[PDB]
């Protein structure tokens, strides 16, 4: 029904678009919410941090839309994809039927190095992993 | 053949009913036993505790029946779903061919926070997980 | 300040013995069941009465108890939620379980999983 | 020589207290976010300013800091990458986290996963 | 091709027979070697121990044959099913394309309590788990 | 009171040496195989004779043994079932294994999995 | 699309060839890069070590080609298959859509004893395991 | 008697320092690669020469070495196979690795997985 699409740098990637196009093909009614892990924690030096994160999320949304994908909403979340997912699910329980986790390729992906692809299963939702 | 349906608060949920209706569609002979994790351990202040748990189980059974699901029996078990399953399987070995674990959505579910969905596999029975 | 997680074992000499060896103590009593069809305000009330009774039992052994709190009936969820409520308030957890062969909490591997929060865990076997 | 992993807790008395109990210290500040669409040179610059600010905070507590480095915003990736950059330079890691209930790093089990590198890990809870 | 069928008490069970009959249906050429975990380690009191184990293995073979299953050979192995598998694979590398692990029901099974069903995967062969 | 888990190593000097360093001892002898087609009363009987023989071997080394019990041939199941039978009776487990390279119990990771019950585990390598 | 085929001693095996022939049948365009774990670390006694490893890789390539398999390239990597994969993925991110891990049979395989078949999943690529 | 697992770090002062703090030592040198297409007798020979060279390096630091053995190039397989060959001969393992950031063995989590055999493991970081 509604998918939580977790992506930032891979928002412009053909592979992500292709998977979402596959999900549209099996379900024309499918809705995609882009969750952009971009918010760093508070620091000593720098609202401004959130504003910058919001800008990254909007830029991500536009990149995914330009690929022919309808995007219901883009949200900036914690810079940890695992923390971002946990916190989005807490904020909106029952909104999402699946997670689409979009990563850079092994060898380049920070999230893969952090084992996000397997740890994302602990939440209890189906996880579709896309390599971009 | 016979499914151990583990649910309490989600007994009235359309998603649970739908899955059980799917299981009926593939097997018209399917039988469902509702195991309701509701029994807290002995305390300092409060038979009465069991009686209250039995009341919750019956209420759960009625909620699931009102959804068009035939329910063979409802049992109240340990308030830990994992302990309840272990103890029901011990009490009736070979009665059940599968577990249907019904949880609240991620973000709201206590059982998901406790990793019941993956830990339930250790018993050796197939686990169908339904989010409600 | 120690987070003492106990319910049935609050009266046990082993836990008293351990706390005497050890400071302030807060008693967290996993006793609040999730909402049901027949009975939230009611079950919470009963849980807080349970917490009060456990606190009396511990104090009767000679232990001063700063506060007792009823938490989620899952010790692990109770601890998580107490740490969230009062961050930085505890320097350690004292987990009091029944002995193996009787402990539900041991069967739920509360003793090992309690370490994930980041605090030192002292495990006492009582009764 | 100790690899001190801290950012927000660089000013915390608990970390100072721990380093006083303990030698040379290098401060590794997980603060560099991955490249984005709007802002790499820019975010790195901001991260290095963040690292400098954390170093001042620690030195202000009475701790001499050999060098401060901004690393990947994931403490685990930061540590891995620092060990790769300067192999053999550190005899231990000092991990300073916020308390459970506030710590993102604890939620990410940085405290347990940090042991995989092969070095002794001392965990300090601050604030 | 050739299956290592791990069973002792469940040798006479309809469910085991049924699965092996399913495997015959998809592959008429399928061959079954019954590995019977029955050999205890050396003790203080009691060749005789092995002889007793061999007797149990033969009894198991006859029980499975009486169910209409062709059995190429029965072997008695270490009383630990995990050690028995490891040692049979060491003794005959490449003989087996799969393991069929037959257990008693959860609540009754020693092997399930010992997590044999998931630990058996570490060897690198496909594992079919049958509950009897 | 210690739960001493041993069978073949009951005569070993290493186990004696360890128990001398350490109290009451109960010897749990994993020796009871599950029911079979040819031989339950019979195999139990043989297992209890095995337990008695192991007890004599240990006592012959200078160790007083309160009781010896034959348990399930899986050390882990034996321990679980003994703790269930007599909850609170043991303050610790003494696990005596053959050395690595000969021990079936080590291969079955009994030494690490024994910790799940909640009791302190002392591991002795014998022979 | 492009598969990282991890094999050394099993390069001449019919089972490996058969799987790659299956992959060709579903995708005539499939490309195979043979990664040969053969490079030991620096020692006290013995460029020469690399040269010997390169010789093993070429020999492996020829063995796989003689089986009717097109091989795009053979590379010698770290003697640890896990380290070899990690390092190849780092050197060429996005080159590979899958890993084909070819092992000797359980009972004989060093890589299986080292749990390479399950540990290989941590990289984030699909793993096809072939026993030879 | 200690099983000292080292190859490149056999000359390292850190390992010497550790062995001086500690008895008999056997040096197990993971250096034997599996059979190949071009080169078994040959690669074994080269591995045993490697083992001899590592033994000289260690002895040159002031450590008496009872025997040096070339084992499987996987430290974990080498250890398993040595324990099988000579059961009961070792009371402990001394694992000498390069530092994190250079160690292949650390990347392979040899330091944590070595504990599964049942013996005490002392981990030395060298170079």
PDB file of C-alpha atoms in Angstrom, chain B residues 8-12 37-46 48-49 51-52 55-56 59-60 62-63 78-80 82-83 86-87 110-111 113-114 122, chain C residues 7-12 30-39 42-43 46 49-50 53-54 57 72-74 76-77 80-81 104-105 107-109 116:
ATOM      1  CA  UNK B   8      -4.839 -10.116  22.203  1.00  0.00           C
ATOM      2  CA  UNK B   9      -5.342  -6.443  21.308  1.00  0.00           C
ATOM      3  CA  UNK B  10      -5.383  -7.234  17.561  1.00  0.00           C
ATOM      4  CA  UNK B  11      -8.214  -9.797  17.879  1.00  0.00           C
ATOM      5  CA  UNK B  12     -10.645  -7.288  16.285  1.00  0.00           C
ATOM      6  CA  UNK B  37      -0.942 -13.650  26.332  1.00  0.00           C
ATOM      7  CA  UNK B  38      -2.664 -12.124  29.365  1.00  0.00           C
ATOM      8  CA  UNK B  39      -1.564 -13.925  32.570  1.00  0.00           C
ATOM      9  CA  UNK B  40       0.795 -11.869  34.744  1.00  0.00           C
ATOM     10  CA  UNK B  41       3.011 -13.661  37.291  1.00  0.00           C
ATOM     11  CA  UNK B  42       2.076 -13.932  41.023  1.00  0.00           C
ATOM     12  CA  UNK B  43       2.390 -10.722  43.059  1.00  0.00           C
ATOM     13  CA  UNK B  44       2.022  -9.355  46.599  1.00  0.00           C
ATOM     14  CA  UNK B  45      -1.482  -7.912  46.323  1.00  0.00           C
ATOM     15  CA  UNK B  46      -3.623  -9.906  43.858  1.00  0.00           C
ATOM     16  CA  UNK B  48      -8.525 -13.647  40.621  1.00  0.00           C
ATOM     17  CA  UNK B  49      -5.623 -12.806  38.274  1.00  0.00           C
ATOM     18  CA  UNK B  51     -10.084 -15.187  36.203  1.00  0.00           C
ATOM     19  CA  UNK B  52      -9.370 -11.704  34.800  1.00  0.00           C
ATOM     20  CA  UNK B  55     -12.201 -12.836  30.793  1.00  0.00           C
ATOM     21  CA  UNK B  56      -9.740 -11.122  28.438  1.00  0.00           C
ATOM     22  CA  UNK B  59     -13.464 -11.138  24.999  1.00  0.00           C
ATOM     23  CA  UNK B  60     -10.702 -11.720  22.448  1.00  0.00           C
ATOM     24  CA  UNK B  62     -15.740 -12.936  20.644  1.00  0.00           C
ATOM     25  CA  UNK B  63     -13.916 -10.105  18.840  1.00  0.00           C
ATOM     26  CA  UNK B  78       1.664 -16.097  30.127  1.00  0.00           C
ATOM     27  CA  UNK B  79       1.726 -12.354  29.478  1.00  0.00           C
ATOM     28  CA  UNK B  80       4.997 -12.956  27.556  1.00  0.00           C
ATOM     29  CA  UNK B  82       7.222 -16.176  23.883  1.00  0.00           C
ATOM     30  CA  UNK B  83       6.598 -17.903  27.226  1.00  0.00           C
ATOM     31  CA  UNK B  86       6.565 -22.378  24.686  1.00  0.00           C
ATOM     32  CA  UNK B  87       4.119 -23.433  27.411  1.00  0.00           C
ATOM     33  CA  UNK B 110       5.476  -4.217  22.366  1.00  0.00           C
ATOM     34  CA  UNK B 111       6.006  -7.712  20.926  1.00  0.00           C
ATOM     35  CA  UNK B 113      10.120  -4.269  20.305  1.00  0.00           C
ATOM     36  CA  UNK B 114      10.797  -7.540  22.120  1.00  0.00           C
ATOM     37  CA  UNK B 122      13.167 -21.035  17.675  1.00  0.00           C
TER      38      UNK B 122
ATOM     39  CA  UNK C   7       8.980  -7.603  41.965  1.00  0.00           C
ATOM     40  CA  UNK C   8       8.510 -11.039  43.569  1.00  0.00           C
ATOM     41  CA  UNK C   9      12.093 -11.037  44.896  1.00  0.00           C
ATOM     42  CA  UNK C  10      11.731  -7.655  46.690  1.00  0.00           C
ATOM     43  CA  UNK C  11      11.419  -9.516  50.040  1.00  0.00           C
ATOM     44  CA  UNK C  12      14.293 -11.905  49.325  1.00  0.00           C
ATOM     45  CA  UNK C  30       7.710  -4.626  36.048  1.00  0.00           C
ATOM     46  CA  UNK C  31       3.995  -5.076  36.622  1.00  0.00           C
ATOM     47  CA  UNK C  32       1.952  -3.007  34.144  1.00  0.00           C
ATOM     48  CA  UNK C  33       0.235  -5.216  31.565  1.00  0.00           C
ATOM     49  CA  UNK C  34      -0.786  -3.798  28.165  1.00  0.00           C
ATOM     50  CA  UNK C  35      -4.366  -2.517  27.634  1.00  0.00           C
ATOM     51  CA  UNK C  36      -7.086  -5.156  27.209  1.00  0.00           C
ATOM     52  CA  UNK C  37     -10.754  -5.618  26.299  1.00  0.00           C
ATOM     53  CA  UNK C  38     -12.299  -5.811  29.777  1.00  0.00           C
ATOM     54  CA  UNK C  39     -10.000  -3.835  32.108  1.00  0.00           C
ATOM     55  CA  UNK C  42      -7.592   0.111  36.285  1.00  0.00           C
ATOM     56  CA  UNK C  43      -4.625  -2.154  35.490  1.00  0.00           C
ATOM     57  CA  UNK C  46      -3.345  -2.321  40.412  1.00  0.00           C
ATOM     58  CA  UNK C  49      -0.359  -0.919  44.318  1.00  0.00           C
ATOM     59  CA  UNK C  50       1.884  -3.869  43.451  1.00  0.00           C
ATOM     60  CA  UNK C  53       3.838  -3.511  48.206  1.00  0.00           C
ATOM     61  CA  UNK C  54       7.214  -4.504  46.769  1.00  0.00           C
ATOM     62  CA  UNK C  57       8.957  -5.563  51.435  1.00  0.00           C
ATOM     63  CA  UNK C  72       5.832  -2.367  31.773  1.00  0.00           C
ATOM     64  CA  UNK C  73       5.434  -6.052  32.705  1.00  0.00           C
ATOM     65  CA  UNK C  74       8.377  -6.825  30.366  1.00  0.00           C
ATOM     66  CA  UNK C  76      13.358  -5.055  29.275  1.00  0.00           C
ATOM     67  CA  UNK C  77      10.673  -2.609  28.104  1.00  0.00           C
ATOM     68  CA  UNK C  80      14.152   1.093  28.453  1.00  0.00           C
ATOM     69  CA  UNK C  81      11.162   3.301  29.324  1.00  0.00           C
ATOM     70  CA  UNK C 104      10.502 -16.170  33.859  1.00  0.00           C
ATOM     71  CA  UNK C 105      12.959 -13.290  33.444  1.00  0.00           C
ATOM     72  CA  UNK C 107      13.951 -17.683  30.497  1.00  0.00           C
ATOM     73  CA  UNK C 108      13.457 -14.382  28.617  1.00  0.00           C
ATOM     74  CA  UNK C 109      17.259 -13.769  28.879  1.00  0.00           C
ATOM     75  CA  UNK C 116      22.394  -3.497  25.711  1.00  0.00           C
TER      76      UNK C 116
END
